Amino acid sequence: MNIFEMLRIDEGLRLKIYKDTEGYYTIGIGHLLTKSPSLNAAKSELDKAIGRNCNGVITKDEAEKLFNQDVDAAVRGILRNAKLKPVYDSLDAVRRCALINMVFQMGETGVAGFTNSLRMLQQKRWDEAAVNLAKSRWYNQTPNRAKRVITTFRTGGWDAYKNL
Structure with missing residues (x-):
């Protein structure tokens, strides 16, 4: 499994303009x-x-092209962000995918606001960080998705996505 496959499970593929869970045009x-x-x-x-x-x-082609730009921009934004970079660098490969996923869904800014959980992930306090991440709008609004991402940070493996 890799970042592209992961995101594509979470986001799906739609060839016609549609509304977000948020009601936004996508x-x-x-x-x-x-x-x-x-x-x-x-x-x-x-x-x-x-x-x-x-x-x-x-x-399809155009969709995947946009997807490649968006993933690239997500990674680059993480790398350029003072708050995100340190966490990113501290993490293993699988967990790095989970942070990329959050950034993709919510933007650099949004993720950078999860101060306390970032702190816990850096410290490698996996179970604590999972409980703290769940205490958010994010989890309440898109619980199945948040819970996949959360298991990923918790476990460090791809099991939440095996099912899917």
Whole structure:
């Protein structure tokens, strides 16, 4: 299992503009287009993103292209972030995937706000950090997904994703 397969289980694949769990306009493999309420604003962002007139619909190909950019940007943002980098560097390969996943879903900023859990992950207090992560909007709003990511940090292996 790797970061791409993991994210694709969590995000799914949709070739037509759709709404987030949050009600936001998205396409592909969890590529948010806009937080704006107009389908029109979304369409426009789409065409800007792809470089063509898409009319709200893309190919598999275009979806995976966006996905590769988004993963790359997530990793690079972690690496550039003063709060994130140290945790990232301290973690093993599997756990590193779980932090990348959070960053992808919620953005650098969002994750960087989980101060106490970051601290615990750095210290390698796996069970404590899992209980602290669960105490969030994130877990309450998307519990099955949060719980997959959490098991990942807890265990250090891919079991939450075996099932799936």
